[PDB]
Scaffold this active site. Structure first.
Site, short mmCIF file in Angstrom:
data_model
loop_
_atom_site.label_atom_id
_atom_site.label_comp_id
_atom_site.label_asym_id
_atom_site.label_seq_id
_atom_site.Cartn_x
_atom_site.Cartn_y
_atom_site.Cartn_z
N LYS A 210 -25.21 33.72 -1.21
CA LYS A 210 -24.09 33.03 -0.55
C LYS A 210 -24.22 31.52 -0.51
CE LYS A 210 -21.71 36.61 1.86
NZ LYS A 210 -21.72 37.11 3.25
N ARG A 245 -27.87 43.58 3.27
CA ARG A 245 -27.07 43.94 2.12
C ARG A 245 -27.41 42.94 1.02
NH1 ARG A 245 -22.08 41.73 0.93
NH2 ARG A 245 -20.75 43.04 -0.42
#
Length: 269
Positions: A210, A245
């Site tokens: 991210k 995740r």
């Protein structure tokens, strides 16, 4: 050593003596055996993920659930569309992952039945248009916990038992790229609200590849963020996360195998 609360999740009663790894999966055969690899690599769950016509989203997701049902690992769906949730549960998916917090009209009705696991994520946005908003918070931590508590209440008010519900602070969705995201990672256990028993809802954390990562490493591209992604996962587990995740499964399992050795020795004293 603290222990995250258990999560009832479809076929599986999941308990967090060690935190678990969710491999992110997303050609249909390409992805069939991409999932046999992930399991072999140590994946404990599989995350089957413009946007898309229901006609299409269904063609590409529903076969995958039936294709992988018999492997017998928790199978998770990344969708906010009630029609998608309704279908996937019928095809036997074990857990619904919803960026929208079960806010789209019908979402709660589509999942209030059965044993499936439900993870409600925090996101800043207008549900009606699905336009992600710009940050706006008092204490971002208080605010995210507050929000998720309202959503756990909504689910419980429609018949959902407290133990099927885990929560997710939503790194990257309406957060200042560094200031808000790292505030939440630093304070991770304080971002989960209380179950009726007093234990906090287990937390799921997804930071893999991210922007919060690329911003602290001088701007590397999404695929050049592996060691950064691993690091965020360890920080998250060091601070409370039940599940993480990730795209890079073996690296994350290797890392967590080191962390668990360490914790195993801090307990032997």
């Amino acid at each position: 050593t603290f222990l995250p609360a258990p999560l009832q999740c479809g076929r599986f009663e999941l308990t967090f003596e060690r935190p678990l790894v969710m491999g992110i999966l997303n050609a249909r055969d390409d992805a069939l055996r991409r999932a046999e690899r992930m399991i072999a690599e140590g994946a404990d769950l599989l995350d089957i993920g413009p946007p898309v016509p229901l006609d299409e989203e269904l063609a590409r997701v529903i076969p995958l659930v039936e294709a992988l049902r018999p492997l017998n690992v928790p199978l998770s769906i990344d969708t906010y569309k009630p029609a998608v949730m309704r279908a996937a549960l019928a095809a036997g998916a074990d857990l619904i992952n919803d960026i929208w917090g079960f806010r789209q009209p019908g979402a709660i009705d589509a999942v209030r039945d059965g044993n499936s696991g439900l993870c409600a994520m925090h996101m800043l946005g207008e549900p009606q248009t699905m336009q992600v908003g710009e940050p706006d918070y008092g204490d971002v931590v208080t605010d995210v916990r507050d929000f998720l508590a309202a959503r756990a209440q909504a689910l419980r008010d429609a018949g959902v038992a407290a133990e099927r519900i885990c929560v997710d602070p939503g790194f990257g969705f309406g957060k200042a790229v560094v200031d808000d995201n790292y505030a939440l990672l630093a304070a991770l256990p304080d971002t989960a609200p209380a179950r009726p028993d007093g234990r906090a809802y287990p937390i799921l954390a997804g930071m893999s590849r991210k922007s919060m990562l690329g911003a602290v490493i001088g701007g590397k591209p999404p695929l050049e963020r592996v060691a950064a992604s691993v690091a965020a996962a360890l920080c998250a587990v060091e601070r409370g996360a039940a599940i993480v995740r990730v795209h890079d499964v073996a690296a994350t399992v290797d890392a967590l195998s080191v962390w668990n050795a360490v914790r195993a020795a801090a307990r032997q004293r």
